[PDB]
């Protein structure tokens, strides 16, 4: 399972 | 033994010719088990191994949504990074991301990782301590400040240390049988005259797992030998690996050479002789 | 900034004439990811060729495995054609059951 949300924008 | 789970992401921009190509794949050790390809009609996270298929609709829905959100973030980042570097809009560019965790035989955390690249080069990475970032250049420095400011390390550590391992354990157990485990190399030697001078001896190692292996040649043992050929380890396509080492020997005098095979699956190192 | 792909052509099992098998073309170490890989039977494209999904190594270089069913004969010639931005032209690697 992947994380619930992605990292905030770079 | 110990295992790992990794997710791989690749977003490639094709300016003037559509939106970034997005490809994501999940790994348990060397086995691909899920995938997403922005070109696929389904637009869903798809199974790739028999043991992940039993997962219900709740699983696939949530994976699809979360993987799709990743691609959107990459899309935005591509624009942002091009901007950082002052690159032209016509150029194609790549973002690659890898994260995951390792666990021991007991299923406990060993380490977690997360690293990102831009055009095949280190961009930014989570340090071993899972608490600090390493920026590869002035541009990544910008991203670093953002990520620190947003406390992104904490929630990532919560995943790598928490959720990640918990699911790896589930996967390992679910597909323990089918998952590739220790397989001893099947070895043999071949002979190929180039002239009658002059012949090639090739030492084969087949159907072995894991990929880690050692093939070495000797003349008039115990005398180690270079001046030999050795192909890179290659996947057989069934979960196992292949490799061979070769040496050019005088039509003699073939019988004075020996091949030596080392693999964790063998009760003892093997010695082959023509 | 760019890297040309290594290429290996081989069978999943030891080649035996008239015996069903699998023909592989392993491409690795390349960048960027856009790559063209065909398996050939006597110069003609082989249809229904599958491959693993794009992945990469620690050094950020990509790798892929292409594969299709095939029954080797003594005369039939099999090969792998690979094209990539770093390639002046498509390189063809023949299948050799001894390598």
CATH superfamily of the largest domain in chain B: MHC class I-like antigen recognition-like
Helix content of chain B: 10-25%
What Rg of chain B do the Cα atoms give? 24 Å
Label the overall shape of chain B.
Answer: elongated
Biggest contact: B-C, 32 and 28 residues
Query: Treating each run of at least 4 consecutive H or I residues as one helix, how many helices of chain C?
Result: 0
CATH class of the largest domain in chain B: Alpha Beta
PDB class: immune system
Keywords: HLA-A*0301, CD8+ T cell immunity, immune system
Assembly: trimeric
Entry title: HIV Nef derived peptide Nef73 complexed to HLA-A*0301
SSE blueprint and pairings:
The complex is a heterotrimer of chains A (10), B (274) and C (99).
Chain A: no helix or strand
Chain B: E1 3-12, E2 21-28, E3 31-37, E4 46-47, H1 57-85, E5 94-103, E6 109-118, E7 122-126, E8 133-135, H2 138-149, H3 152-174, E9 186-193, E10 199-208, E11 214-219, E12 224-225, E13 228-230, E14 234-235, E15 241-249, E16 257-262, E17 270-272
Antiparallel strand pairs in B: 1-2, 1-5, 2-3, 3-4, 5-6, 6-7, 7-8, 9-10, 10-15, 11-12, 11-16, 13-15, 14-15, 16-17
Chain C: E1 6-11, E2 21-30, E3 35-41, E4 44-45, E5 50-51, E6 55-56, E7 62-70, E8 78-84, E9 91-94
Antiparallel strand pairs in C: 1-2, 2-7, 3-4, 3-8, 5-7, 6-7, 8-9
Structure notes:
Chain C: Residues 5-93 form the Ig-like C1-type domain. The complex is a heterotrimer of chains A (10), B (274) and C (99). Chain A is mostly loops and 10 residues long. The termini of chain A are far apart. Chain B has two domains: 1-181, Murine Class I Major Histocompatibility Complex, H2-DB, Chain A, domain 1 (2-Layer Sandwich); 182-274, Immunoglobulin-like (Sandwich), CATH 2.60.40.10. Chain B contains three helices and 17 strands. Chain B has 274 residues and is an alpha+beta fold. Chain C has no helices and nine strands. Chain C has strands at residues 6-11, 21-30, 35-41, 44-45, 50-51, 55-56, 62-70, 78-84, 91-94. In chain C, strand 3 and strand 4 (44-45) form a beta hairpin. Chain C is elongated and about 45 Å long. Classes of the chains: A little secondary structure (10), B alpha+beta (274), C mainly beta (99).
Descriptive keywords:
heterotrimer; B: 274 residues; alpha+beta; Murine Class I Major Histocompatibility Complex, H2-DB, Chain A, domain 1; Immunoglobulin-like; 2 domains; 3 helices; C: 99 residues; mainly beta; 5-stranded antiparallel sheet; 4-stranded antiparallel sheet; 9 strands; immune system
């Amino acid at each position: 399972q992947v994380p619930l949300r992605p990292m905030t924008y770079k | 033994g110990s295992h790992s789970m990794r997710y791989f992401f690749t977003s490639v921009s094709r300016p003037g010719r559509g939106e970034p190509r997005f490809i994501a794949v999940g790994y348990v050790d060397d086995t691909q088990f899920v995938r997403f390809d922005s070109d696929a009609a389904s637009q869903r996270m798809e199974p790739r191994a028999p043991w992940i298929e039993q997962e219900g609709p709740e699983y696939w829905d949530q994976e699809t949504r979360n993987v799709k959100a990743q691609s959107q973030t990459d899309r935005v980042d591509l624009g942002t990074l091009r901007g950082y570097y002052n690159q032209s809009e016509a150029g194609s560019h790549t973002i690659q991301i890898m994260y995951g965790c390792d666990v021991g035989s007991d299923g406990r955390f060993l380490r977690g990782y997360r690293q990102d690249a831009y055009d095949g080069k280190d961009y930014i990475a989570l340090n071993e301590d899972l608490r600090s970032w390493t920026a590869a250049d002035m541009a990544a420095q910008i991203t670093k400040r953002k990520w620190e400011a947003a406390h992104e390390a904490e929630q990532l550590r919560a995943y790598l240390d928490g959720t990640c391992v918990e699911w790896l354990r589930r996967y390992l157990e679910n597909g323990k049988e089918t998952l590739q485990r220790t397989d001893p190399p099947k070895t043999h030697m071949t002979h190929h005259p180039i002239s009658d001078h002059e012949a090639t001896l090739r030492c084969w190692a087949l159907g072995f797992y894991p990929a880690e292996i050692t093939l070495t040649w000797q003349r008039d043992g115990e005398d180690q030998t270079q001046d030999t050929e050795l192909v890179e380890t290659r996947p057989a396509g069934d979960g196992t690996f292949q490799k061979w080492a070769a040496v050019v020997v005088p039509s003699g005098e073939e019988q004075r050479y020996t091949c030596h095979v080392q693999h964790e699956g063998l009760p003892k190192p093997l010695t082959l002789r023509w | 900034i760019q890297r040309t792909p290594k290429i290996q052509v081989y069978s999943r099992h030891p080649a035996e004439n008239g015996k069903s098998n699998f023909l592989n073309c392993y491409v690795s170490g390349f960048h960027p990811s856009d790559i063209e890989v065909d398996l050939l039977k006597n110069g003609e494209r082989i249809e229904k060729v599958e491959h693993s999904d794009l992945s990469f190594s620690k050094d950020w270089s990509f790798y892929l495995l292409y594969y299709t069913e095939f029954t080797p004969t003594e005369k039939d010639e099999y090969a792998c054609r690979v094209n990539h931005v770093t390639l002046s032209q498509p390189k063809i690697v023949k299948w050799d059951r001894d390598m």
